[PDB]
C-alpha cells in the first residue's frame, strides 16, 4: 500500500450545509488520501448504502486512483432512481447513472437541515428535457422549453415553459416527499498510480 | 486557519462612495456566502447583504437596496463591498462574516468567520 | 421584517452565577435563531446556532433553548471572558440581529 497518512475528506462531503440541485450535482474528485469507508458503512444514519461492483465490507481492500463524489438533494420518493437502469424524472433529466456503474450509492433523510417551516423552494430539479441524460451528464442550461410548434424566442408564454422546477420541502410532509440528500461514489481505476487507498498499515 | 483580511481605514466625505475589500483565505472561496455586516459606533449590529463567491448573484436588505453593489474576484479571492451616496449616518464598523460550511441548515444564515473590521468615517 | 427584542438590554452579574436572556421574537421563527457574543472592541463570535447548538471551539458553559417566539440564551456560570454583548439572529427572513445584551460584572 502507498506511503500515504492523510484523511480524505469525506466530512466536507457529507456534513456540507448546503446541497447542490439535483440538476447542478456536484461532482468532488476525492484523490491522494486514505479513504476509511467502514465507519461510512457502519453508521447508522444513512437509510440508503446500496454498493454495486464493490462490496462495502471489502472496500476496505480495495486502491482506486481517483473517487468521485457527486452529492445533491432530492425527494424521498425518487431515491429508488439513482440506481443503475431506472426511469423516471430524475434518472433521466437530471442524474443518470451508468448500467455499468461500480460504487456506492449514499442517501439519508436531511428534513432537518432542508425542511423550512414556511417552505424551502431552494432546490430545483429539471422538468422539461428532450432527451434522456447521458450517463454522468450534468445539463445546467435554463434556456425556455419548447413543448411546441411555435419557437420561445426567450419569452415564457403558453407553450414555452422554464425547464427548472422547485422541490417544495416543509417539515410536516410524509416521508416520501422529504429531502434526502443523495451522495454517489464512483470508484475510477484507470492505468495510474493508486492514490485512494484502504486504511490497511504495510 | 481561516481568515478574513480586511482593507484598513476609511475617512470619507458626504455623497462619496467607498469600497471595503475582504481577502478570504484557508478555506475554499466558492464554497459559502460572504455577509456583510456594519455596527454604528456604539449601536448594534445591522445585516447588509450576501454575495454567492460561486454564482455571482448577491441579495440585500429592503433598506440597502440601490445603494450597496457586491463584487467578488475569484482569482485573488476577495470581496468586495462598494457603498455609494455616503450620509453621515454611514459610520460604522463594516464587518465581511463568512457563512457556515459544515453543519446547520441549507437555507440558514450563519455569520461563521468574521472579518476584523473596517470602520468608515463619513464627514465633512 | 422581523423584530427581535432582546428584554435584558444590561445584566449585572458576578462571576460565577447562571446568566440567562431571551430574544423574544416578533413571529414564529421556529428554532432559527442564533447567538453571537461580541467583546469589547472585537468582531462577533458564533456561539449558538439554530437555537440549541453550541458552536464548535465554544465553552461548554454556554446553552441555548426556546423554540417559536420566545427563545432563551444561558451561561451556566459566569466568567471574566464572557463580558460582551449578546446579539441574537434569525434567518426565518433574511437576518435581522437583536437590540443586544449588554453584561458587566457586578461587585
Known amino acids: 500500500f502507498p506511503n500515504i497518512t492523510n484523511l480524505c475528506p469525506f466530512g466536507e462531503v457529507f456534513n456540507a450545509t448546503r446541497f447542490a440541485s439535483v440538476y447542478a450535482w456536484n461532482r468532488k474528485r476525492i484523490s491522494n488520501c486514505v479513504a476509511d469507508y467502514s465507519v461510512l458503512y457502519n453508521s447508522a444514519s444513512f437509510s440508503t448504502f446500496k454498493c454495486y461492483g464493490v462490496s462495502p465490507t471489502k472496500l476496505n481492500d480495495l486502491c482506486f486512483t481517483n473517487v468521485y463524489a457527486d452529492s445533491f438533494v432530492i425527494r424521498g420518493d425518487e431515491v429508488r432512481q439513482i440506481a443503475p437502469g431506472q426511469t423516471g424524472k430524475i434518472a433521466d433529466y437530471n442524474y443518470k447513472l451508468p448500467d455499468d456503474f461500480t460504487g456506492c450509492v449514499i442517501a439519508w433523510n436531511s428534513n432537518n437541515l432542508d425542511s423550512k417551516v414556511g417552505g424551502n423552494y431552494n432546490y430545483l430539479y429539471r422538468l422539461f428535457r428532450k432527451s434522456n441524460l447521458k450517463p454522468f451528464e450534468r445539463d445546467i442550461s435554463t434556456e425556455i422549453y419548447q413543448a411546441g410548434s411555435t419557437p420561445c424566442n426567450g419569452v415564457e408564454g403558453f407553450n414555452c415553459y422554464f425547464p427548472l422546477q422547485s422541490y417544495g420541502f416543509q417539515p410536516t410532509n410524509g416521508v416520501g416527499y422529504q429531502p434526502y440528500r443523495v451522495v454517489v461514489l464512483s470508484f475510477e481505476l484507470l492505468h495510474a498510480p493508486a492514490t485512494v487507498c484502504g486504511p490497511k498499515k504495510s | 486557519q481561516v481568515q478574513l483580511v480586511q482593507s484598513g481605514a476609511e475617512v470619507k466625505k458626504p455623497g462619496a462612495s467607498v469600497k471595503v475589500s475582504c481577502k478570504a483565505s484557508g478555506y475554499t472561496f466558492t464554497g459559502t456566502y460572504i455577509h456583510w455586516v456594519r455596527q454604528a459606533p456604539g449601536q448594534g449590529l445591522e445585516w447588509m447583504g450576501w454575495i454567492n463567491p460561486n454564482s455571482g448573484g448577491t441579495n440585500f436588505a429592503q433598506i440597502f437596496q440601490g445603494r450597496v453593489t457586491l463584487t467578488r474576484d475569484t482569482s485573488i479571492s476577495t470581496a468586495y463591498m462598494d457603498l455609494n451616496r455616503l450620509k453621515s449616518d454611514d459610520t460604522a464598523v463594516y464587518y465581511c462574516?463568512?457563512?457556515?460550511?459544515?453543519?446547520?441548515?441549507?437555507?440558514?444564515?450563519?455569520?461563521?468567520?468574521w472579518g476584523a473590521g473596517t470602520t468608515v468615517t463619513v464627514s465633512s | 421584517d422581523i423584530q427581535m427584542t432582546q428584554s435584558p438590554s444590561s445584566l449585572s452579574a458576578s462571576v460565577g452565577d447562571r446568566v440567562t436572556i431571551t430574544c423574544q421574537a416578533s413571529?414564529?421563527?421556529?428554532?432559527?435563531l442564533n447567538w453571537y457574543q461580541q467583546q469589547p472592541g472585537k468582531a462577533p463570535k458564533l456561539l449558538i446556532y439554530d437555537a440549541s447548538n453550541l458552536e464548535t471551539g465554544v465553552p461548554s458553559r454556554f446553552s441555548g433553548s426556546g423554540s417559536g417566539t420566545d427563545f432563551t440564551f444561558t451561561i451556566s456560570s459566569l466568567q471574566p471572558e464572557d463580558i460582551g454583548t449578546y446579539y441574537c439572529?434569525?434567518?426565518?427572513?433574511?437576518?435581522?440581529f437583536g437590540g443586544g445584551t449588554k453584561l458587566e460584572i457586578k461587585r
Open positions: 413571529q414564529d421563527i421556529s428554532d432559527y
Open positions: 439572529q434569525q434567518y426565518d427572513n433574511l437576518p435581522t
Open positions: 462574516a463568512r457563512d457556515r460550511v459544515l453543519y446547520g441548515r441549507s437555507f440558514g444564515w450563519y455569520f461563521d468567520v
